[PDB]
Ligand binder design. Structure first.
Ligand SMILES: N=C(N)NCCC[C@@H](C(=O)O)N1CCC1=O
Length: 323
């Protein structure tokens, strides 16, 4: 990854805590007002952090992510026990890394929930569960394979944001990012041509099944010289042999350029969900009250037909498959 891809925020700690101190303490009681307050704070971010975010937002980067480090997370003993259920309690007090997702998220765009997913909530806790389905972010011992988040969804978000309150005990779990800007040079022009703008059948995540490959996903699309990426190692279901072979080439190229990010407390990862695919490698939970704990939100921006007018940060949208 490039120098500019990692932003050390430790010098900003007091300023960021001051911004958090004026946000509503019980965000889920009035999420729209909470995120409006966070938008006001976003305009007051430290100049260097605001600039890094704005630059990345304009047109992503070669790496496809922005990693903020050293944000003012609570000490471990000042955090509650790691959640073991979803959705979160409506009265749960705001945590510092959630405040960062609010302020840094509003600098980028509009927080978005998905009605059928995690009870239609905007803030997701990402924690291990002992019976996790293999297509669940609650997995641990089994690799969560590469996916563009909701690539099959008409209202797919520009960004996935992951903020770390607890790492896993052994700091083993790696968040993998595969950037199409790094992978594309490894893909032959002939395979690029087969992938580009070609809709292929795609299954959907369990939350959206209510059924087979009810969506169509274009693995590459947009500008052929700098394409967007829609990839899902588990759900993409090409039928034609040439399509299966083209996707296999794409899949191996993303593997070869994959970068591993190990999230630690105070880290916040912004993933460009139109140009990357992401994964999480195995770890072993201990069920001791201190298991790995991320906070996840989704951000929409005004491009790629994510928005059609009037949307607000906090909106929850219904499922429509890409066709
Ligand atoms: N290749 C895949 N699709 N893996 C499952 C993604 C994780 C899943 C979850 O949060 O449990 N998810 C992301 C949107 C949604 O549902």
């Amino acid at each position: 990854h490039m120098m500019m891809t990692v932003v050390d925020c430790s010098e900003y700690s007091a300023d960021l805590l001051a911004l958090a101190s004026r946000l509503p303490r019980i965000p889920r009681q009035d999420l729209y007002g909470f995120l409006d307050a966070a938008h006001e704070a976003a305009g007051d971010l430290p100049e260097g952090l605001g600039t890094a975010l704005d630059r990345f937002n304009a047109d992503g980067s070669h790496d496809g992510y922005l990693m903020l480090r050293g944000l003012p997370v609570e000490d471990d003993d000042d955090l509650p026990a790691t959640p073991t259920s979803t959705p979160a309690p409506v009265d749960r007090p705001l945590q510092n890394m959630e405040a960062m997702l609010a302020v840094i998220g509003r600098r980028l765009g509009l927080h978005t929930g998905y009605r059928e997913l995690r009870s239609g909530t905007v803030y997701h806790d990402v924690y291990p569960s002992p019976g996790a389905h293999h297509l669940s972010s609650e997995t641990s011992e089994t690799l969560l394979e590469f996916h563009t988040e909701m690539a099959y969804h008409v209202l797919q978000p520009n960004y996935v944001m992951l903020a770390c309150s607890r790492a896993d005990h052994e700091r083993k779990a790696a968040t993998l990012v595969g950037s199409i800007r790094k992978a594309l040079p490894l893909i032959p022009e002939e395979v690029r041509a087969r992938l580009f703008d070609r809709p292929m059948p795609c299954c959907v995540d369990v939350a959206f099944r209510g059924p087979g490959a009810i969506a169509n996903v274009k693995p590459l699309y947009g500008d052929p010289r700098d394409p967007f990426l829609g990839y899902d190692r588990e759900l993409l279901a090409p039928r034609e042999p040439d399509d299966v072979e083209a996707v296999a080439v794409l899949s191996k190229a993303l593997d070869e350029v994959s970068e591993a990010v190990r999230l630690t407390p105070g880290d916040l990862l912004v993933v460009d969900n139109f140009r990357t695919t992401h994964a999480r490698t195995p770890f072993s939970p201990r069920w001791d009250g201190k298991d790995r704990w991320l906070h996840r939100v989704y951000i929409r921006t005004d491009r790629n037909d994510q928005l059609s007018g009037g949307e607000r940060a906090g909106d929850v949208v219904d499922f429509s498959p890409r066709r």
